[PDB]
Design a protein around this ligand. Structure first.
Ligand SMILES: CC(C)N1CCN(c2ccc(/C(=C(/CCCO)c3ccccc3)c3cccc(O)c3)cc2)CC1
Length: 221
């Protein structure tokens, strides 16, 4: 329960979405709200990544290559998790919950129903925070960057969290021996949500004027 518990120990406190009650809800209102929210989560994810046992010792050039590859998947994974104790809604933040009608209004119904599949599949198999923490970290390790300096040391980080997930699953879950595989086999749908999400993010020109790669190196200092 070592890495799992240490992952568990390194979760960030809940950050809050804080929508304007002054502004009539709209397309522009929703995208503004979620934009500011993700910006704040990203600050917290650079912080949370630094606590991944092993992440700190790699290149700065490779620390970017992961976050730049994982950050949307990690955003989505958090939202997926908060969303289980609800029904057919997405909990971006405790104070911000979007349902089908609200997705259709932000121009995200397509993407959200996909993320709602991941909500469903996880709750269908009663996912545990220990499993969430360890999967969330796995997604950051296996983001498949195009350009890694130590293509060896990353596989180490993958192999460790991989072991952690088997050791834990073997341990607290002997009811199902083909269960980490099940857990690992959700990773694909989570890539497709992220891939579509990232594409939309560009199509409506949300990247701003400093490239994401530039912002990630700043924070990692
Ligand atoms: C200027 C730059 C530094 N910024 C800009 C904003 N950007 C951003 C905006 C929006 C998002 C999300 C979404 C979620 C839609 C899923 O249904 C999104 C994606 C594409 C288009 C419209 C909404 C998001 C995801 C999960 C959690 C969450 O809080 C926010 C992420 C990131 C981050 C960086």
């Amino acid at each position: 329960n070592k890495i799992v518990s240490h992952l568990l120990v390194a979760e960030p406190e809940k950050i809050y979405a804080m929508p304007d009650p002054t502004v009539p809800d709209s397309d522009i209102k929703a995208l503004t709200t979620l934009c500011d929210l993700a910006d704040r989560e990203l600050v917290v994810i650079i912080g949370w990544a630094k606590h991944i046992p092993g992440f700190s010792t790699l290149s700065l050039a490779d620390q970017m290559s992961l976050l730049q590859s994982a950050w949307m998947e990690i955003l989505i994974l958090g939202v997926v998790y908060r969303s289980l104790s609800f029904e057919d809604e997405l909990v971006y933040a405790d104070d911000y919950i979007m349902d089908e009608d609200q997705s259709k209004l932000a121009g995200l119904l397509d993407l959200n129903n996909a993320i709602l599949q991941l909500v469903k599949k996880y709750k269908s198999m009663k996912l545990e925070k220990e499993e969430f923490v360890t999967l969330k970290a796995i997604a950051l390790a296996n983001s498949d960057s195009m350009h890694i300096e130590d293509v060896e040391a990353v596989q180490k980080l993958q192999d460790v969290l991989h072991e952690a997930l088997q050791d834990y699953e073997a341990g607290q879950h002997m009811e199902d021996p083909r269960r980490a595989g099940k857990m690992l086999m959700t990773l694909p749908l989570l890539r497709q949500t992220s891939t579509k999400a990232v594409q939309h993010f560009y199509n409506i020109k949300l990247e701003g004027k400093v490239p994401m790669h530039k912002l990630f190196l700043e924070m990692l200092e």
